[PDB]
Amino acid sequence: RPTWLPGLNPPAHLKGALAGDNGFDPLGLGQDEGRLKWYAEAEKTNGRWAMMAVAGILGQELLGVTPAWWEAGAKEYDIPAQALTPIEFIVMGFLEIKRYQGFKQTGTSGFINSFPFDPAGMNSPSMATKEVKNGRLAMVAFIGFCVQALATRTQPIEGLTAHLADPFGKNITYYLTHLPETL
Amino acid sequence: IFLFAGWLHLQPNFQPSLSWFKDAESRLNHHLSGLFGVSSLAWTGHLVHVAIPESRGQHVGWDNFLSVLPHPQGLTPFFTGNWAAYAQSPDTASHVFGTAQGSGQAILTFLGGFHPQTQSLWLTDMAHHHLAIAVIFIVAGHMYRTN
Amino acid sequence: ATKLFPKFSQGLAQDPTTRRIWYGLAMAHDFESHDGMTEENLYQKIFASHFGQLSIIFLWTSGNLFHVAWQGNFEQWVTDPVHIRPIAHAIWDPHFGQPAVEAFTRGGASGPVNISTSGVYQWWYTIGMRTNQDLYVGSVFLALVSAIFLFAGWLHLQPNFQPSLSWFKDAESRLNHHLSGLFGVSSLAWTGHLVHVAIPESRGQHVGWDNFLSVLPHPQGLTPFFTGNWAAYAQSPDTASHVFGTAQGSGQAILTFLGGFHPQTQSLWLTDMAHHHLAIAVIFIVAGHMYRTNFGIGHRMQAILEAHTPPSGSLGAGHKGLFDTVNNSLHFQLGLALASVGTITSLVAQHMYSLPPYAFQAIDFTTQAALYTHHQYIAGFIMCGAFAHGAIFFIRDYDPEQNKGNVLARMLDHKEALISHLSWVSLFLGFHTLGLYVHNDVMQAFGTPEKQILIEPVFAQWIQAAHGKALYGFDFLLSSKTSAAFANGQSLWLPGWLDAINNNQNSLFLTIGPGDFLVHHAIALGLHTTTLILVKGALDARGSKLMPDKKDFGYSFPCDGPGRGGTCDISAYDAFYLAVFWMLNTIGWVTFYWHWKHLTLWQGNVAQFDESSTYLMGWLRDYLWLNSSQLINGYNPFGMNSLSVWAWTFLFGHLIYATGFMFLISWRGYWQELIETLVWAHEKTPLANLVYWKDKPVALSIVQARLVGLAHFSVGYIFTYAAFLIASTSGRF
Amino acid sequence: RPMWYPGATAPAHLDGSMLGDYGFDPLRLGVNKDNLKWFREAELTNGRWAMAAVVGILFTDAVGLPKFWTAGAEKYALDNQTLALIEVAVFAVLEGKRYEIYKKTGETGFLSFAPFDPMGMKSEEMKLKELKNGRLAMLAFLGFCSQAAVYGKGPIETLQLHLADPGHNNIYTSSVGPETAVTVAVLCVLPMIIEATK
Amino acid sequence: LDPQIVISGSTAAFLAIGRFVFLGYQRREANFDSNSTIFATNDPAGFNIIDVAGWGALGHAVGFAVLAINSLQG
Amino acid sequence: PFVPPSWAPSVFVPLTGLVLPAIAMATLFVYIEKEAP
CATH number of the domain bearing residue A89: 1.10.3460.10
Strand residues in C274-365 grouped as ranges (E)? none
Burial class (CB in 10 A: 0-12, 13-18, 19+), B140: middle
The answer to whether A24 and A4 are in contact (CB under 8 A) is yes
Kind of pairing between the strands at C635-636 and C113-114: unpaired
Kind of pairing between the strands at C639-640 and C635-636: antiparallel
Q: How far apart are CA C629 and CA C627, in angstroms?
A: 6
Q: How far apart are CA C535 and CA C530, in angstroms?
A: 8
Strand residues in chain F grouped as ranges (E)? none
Whether A131 is covered by a domain: the verdict is yes
Whether A69 is covered by a domain: the verdict is yes
* Nearest one of C649, C620, C618, C617 to C632, comparing CA atoms: C649
Burial class (CB in 10 A: 0-12, 13-18, 19+), D91: exposed
Within 13 A of D49's CA, how many CA atoms are on the CB side?
8
The answer to whether D24 and D4 are in contact (CB under 8 A) is yes
Q: How many domains does chain A have?
A: 1
Three-state DSSP class for residue C297: coil
Whether A15 is covered by a domain: the verdict is no
DSSP C320-344: TTHHHHHHT-HHHHHHHHHHHHHHH
Nearest residue of D to residue A92 by CA position?
D188
* Nearest one of E74, E60, E73, E69 to E6, comparing CA atoms: E60
φ and ψ of C362, to 5 deg: -70, -35
φ and ψ of C635, to 5 deg: -140, 130
Integer-rounded Cα radius of gyration of chain F:
16
Chain E CB within 8 Å of residue D124 CB: no
Say which residues have a Cβ less than 8 Å from residue A107's Cβ, sequence separation at least 6: A37, A41
What letters, b where the CB count within 10 A reaches 16 and e where it falls short, cover C196-225?
bbbbbbbbeeebbeeeeeeeebbeeeeebb
Identify the experimental approach. cryo-EM
* Nearest one of D6, D2, D42 to D22, comparing CA atoms: D2
Three-state DSSP class for residue C17: strand
* Nearest one of A101, A74, C283 to D196, comparing CA atoms: A101
> Please, what is the angle between helix C514-539 and helix C458-467, to 10°?
100
φ and ψ of B21, to 5 deg: -75, -20
The answer to whether A57 and A156 are in contact (CB under 8 A) is yes
Q: How far apart are CA C472 and CA C501, in angstroms?
A: 13
Whether A172 is covered by a domain: the verdict is yes
With contacts defined as CB-CB under 8 Å, which chain E residues touch D120? Answer: 38-41, 48-49
* Residue A129: domain span: 33-182
Return left, alpha or beta for A129; rule: phi > 0 is left, psi -120 to 50 is alpha, else beta.
Answer: alpha
Q: How far apart are CA A107 and CA A36, in angstroms?
A: 12
With contacts defined as CB-CB under 8 Å, which chain A residues touch B74? Answer: 179-180, 183
Burial class (CB in 10 A: 0-12, 13-18, 19+), C249: middle
Three-state DSSP class for residue C224: helix
DSSP C419-478: HHHHHHHHHHHHHHHHHHHHHHHHHHHTT-GGGS-----HHHHHHHHHHT--SS----TT
What resolution in angstroms does the PDB record give?
A: 17.1
Question: Which residues of D fall below an 8 Å CB-CB distance to A?
Answer: 5-7, 166-168, 170, 172-173, 177, 180-181, 184-185, 188-189, 191-192, 195
Whether A20 is covered by a domain: the verdict is no
C-alpha pair distances (Å), D21 with each of D9, D48, D108, D140: 11, 18, 20, 20
Contact criterion met (CB < 8 Å) for E36 and C227: no
Nearest residue of C to residue D166 by CA position?
C210
With contacts defined as CB-CB under 8 Å, which chain C residues touch E37? Answer: 294-295
C-alpha pair distances (Å), E65 with each of C184, C227, D28: 18, 12, 58
Burial class (CB in 10 A: 0-12, 13-18, 19+), C501: buried
Contact criterion met (CB < 8 Å) for D123 and E49: no
The answer to whether C462 and C450 are in contact (CB under 8 A) is no
Integer-rounded Cα radius of gyration of chain D:
21
Contact criterion met (CB < 8 Å) for E39 and D118: no
Whether A173 is covered by a domain: the verdict is yes
Q: Measure the CA angle with vertex A106, ends A104 and A112; round to 5°.
A: 75
Three-state DSSP class for residue C570: coil
Beta carbons within 10 angstroms of residue C513's beta carbon: 19
The answer to whether C397 and C331 are in contact (CB under 8 A) is yes
Nearest residue of B to residue A34 by CA position?
B13
Whether A125 is covered by a domain: the verdict is yes
Which among E37, E48, E52 has the least Cβ separation from residue D123? E37
User: What one-letter code names the amino acid at C151?
Assistant: F
Contact criterion met (CB < 8 Å) for C2 and F36: yes
First to last CA, chain B: 30
Return left, alpha or beta for A8; rule: phi > 0 is left, psi -120 to 50 is alpha, else beta.
Answer: beta
Say which residues have a Cβ less than 8 Å from residue C635's Cβ, sequence separation at least 6: C644, C647, C648
Torsion of CA E37, E43, E48, E49, to 10 degrees: -110
CA distance D139 to chain C (A): 23
The answer to whether C443 and C449 are in contact (CB under 8 A) is yes
Which among F10, F32, F34 has the least Cβ separation from residue C92? F10
Q: How far apart are CA A60 and CA A52, in angstroms?
A: 12
C-alpha pair distances (Å), A173 with each of A181, B70, B90: 13, 19, 28
The answer to whether C703 and C557 are in contact (CB under 8 A) is yes
Q: How far apart are CA C659 and CA D65, in angstroms?
A: 77
The answer to whether C356 and C266 are in contact (CB under 8 A) is yes
Contact criterion met (CB < 8 Å) for A183 and B75: no
Cis peptide before C6 (omega within 30 of 0): yes
Q: How far apart are CA B33 and CA B139, in angstroms?
A: 7
Contact criterion met (CB < 8 Å) for A180 and B72: yes
What letters, b where the CB count within 10 A reaches 16 and e where it falls short, cover D21-54?
bebebeeeebeeeeebeeebbeebeebbebbebb
CA distance A84 to chain D (A): 9
Return left, alpha or beta for C468; rule: phi > 0 is left, psi -120 to 50 is alpha, else beta.
Answer: left
* Nearest one of E4, E3, D62 to C230, comparing CA atoms: E3
C-alpha pair distances (Å), D104 with each of B106, D30, D32, D97, D118: 85, 22, 20, 11, 20
The answer to whether C261 and C497 are in contact (CB under 8 A) is no
Burial class (CB in 10 A: 0-12, 13-18, 19+), C704: middle
Three-state DSSP class for residue D63: helix
The answer to whether A175 and A152 are in contact (CB under 8 A) is yes
The answer to whether C331 and C390 are in contact (CB under 8 A) is yes
The answer to whether D117 and E37 are in contact (CB under 8 A) is no
The answer to whether E71 and C229 are in contact (CB under 8 A) is yes
User: What one-letter code names the amino acid at C678?
Assistant: L
Cis peptide before C558 (omega within 30 of 0): no
C-alpha pair distances (Å), C593 with each of C96, C347, C364, C521, C614: 36, 17, 19, 12, 12
CA distance C182 to chain E (A): 20
Contact criterion met (CB < 8 Å) for C303 and E1: no
Contact criterion met (CB < 8 Å) for A179 and B74: yes
* Nearest one of C503, C446, C505, C431 to C470, comparing CA atoms: C503
Q: How far apart are CA C711 and CA C582, in angstroms?
A: 14
The answer to whether C87 and C115 are in contact (CB under 8 A) is yes
Whether A136 is covered by a domain: the verdict is yes
Which DSSP helix (H) or strand (E) runs through C113? strand C113-114
The answer to whether C288 and C176 are in contact (CB under 8 A) is yes
Kind of pairing between the strands at C113-114 and C89-90: antiparallel
Task: Quickly list H helices, chain E.
Answer: 3-20, 23-32, 49-71
Q: Which long-range contacts (CB under 8 A, 24 or more apart) does D93-102 make?
A: D102/D41
C-alpha pair distances (Å), D62 with each of B43, C208, C516, D65, D133: 60, 21, 60, 8, 21
The answer to whether C568 and C559 are in contact (CB under 8 A) is yes
First to last CA, chain A: 48
Q: What is the largest CA-CA distance in chain C?
A: 95
Which among F2, F9, F32 has the least Cβ separation from residue C92? F9
Within 13 A of C260's CA, how many CA atoms are on the CB side?
22
CA distance D65 to chain E (A): 22
DSSP C691: S
The answer to whether C71 and F9 are in contact (CB under 8 A) is no
Q: How far apart are CA F37 and CA F32, in angstroms?
A: 14
With contacts defined as CB-CB under 8 Å, which chain D residues touch A99? Answer: none
> Please, what is the angle between helix B123-140 and helix B39-46, to 10°?
160
Tally B–D CB contacts below 8 A: 9
Q: How far apart are CA A137 and CA A20, in angstroms?
A: 12
φ and ψ of C270, to 5 deg: -70, -35
